[PDB]
mmCIF file of C-alpha atoms in Angstrom:
data_model
loop_
_atom_site.group_PDB
_atom_site.id
_atom_site.type_symbol
_atom_site.label_atom_id
_atom_site.label_comp_id
_atom_site.label_asym_id
_atom_site.label_seq_id
_atom_site.Cartn_x
_atom_site.Cartn_y
_atom_site.Cartn_z
ATOM 1 C CA UNK E 1 264.743 113.232 143.754
ATOM 2 C CA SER E 2 263.893 110.384 144.684
ATOM 3 C CA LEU E 3 260.199 111.321 144.250
ATOM 4 C CA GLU E 4 259.284 109.527 141.089
ATOM 5 C CA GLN E 5 262.698 107.931 140.698
ATOM 6 C CA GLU E 6 262.576 104.639 142.698
ATOM 7 C CA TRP E 7 259.109 103.988 141.324
ATOM 8 C CA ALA E 8 259.742 105.084 137.713
ATOM 9 C CA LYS E 9 262.433 102.345 138.056
ATOM 10 C CA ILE E 10 259.710 99.937 139.333
ATOM 11 C CA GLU E 11 257.515 100.529 136.244
ATOM 12 C CA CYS E 12 260.425 100.305 133.746
ATOM 13 C CA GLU E 13 261.266 96.999 135.307
ATOM 14 C CA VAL E 14 258.861 95.646 132.833
ATOM 15 C CA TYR E 15 255.487 94.648 133.782
ATOM 16 C CA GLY E 16 254.504 96.841 130.777
ATOM 17 C CA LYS E 17 253.729 100.145 132.408
ATOM 18 C CA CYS E 18 256.360 102.834 131.853
ATOM 19 C CA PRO E 19 256.403 104.776 128.510
ATOM 20 C CA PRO E 20 258.173 102.043 126.875
ATOM 21 C CA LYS E 21 261.741 101.544 128.227
ATOM 22 C CA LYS E 22 263.533 98.693 130.081
#
C-alpha cells in the first residue's frame, strides 16, 4: 501496495482532492 493506496483513500475521502471519486 500500500504505497499510494492508504493515501489515495485519504484524498477520496472528500476534502475535494482526488480525481473526482468518493
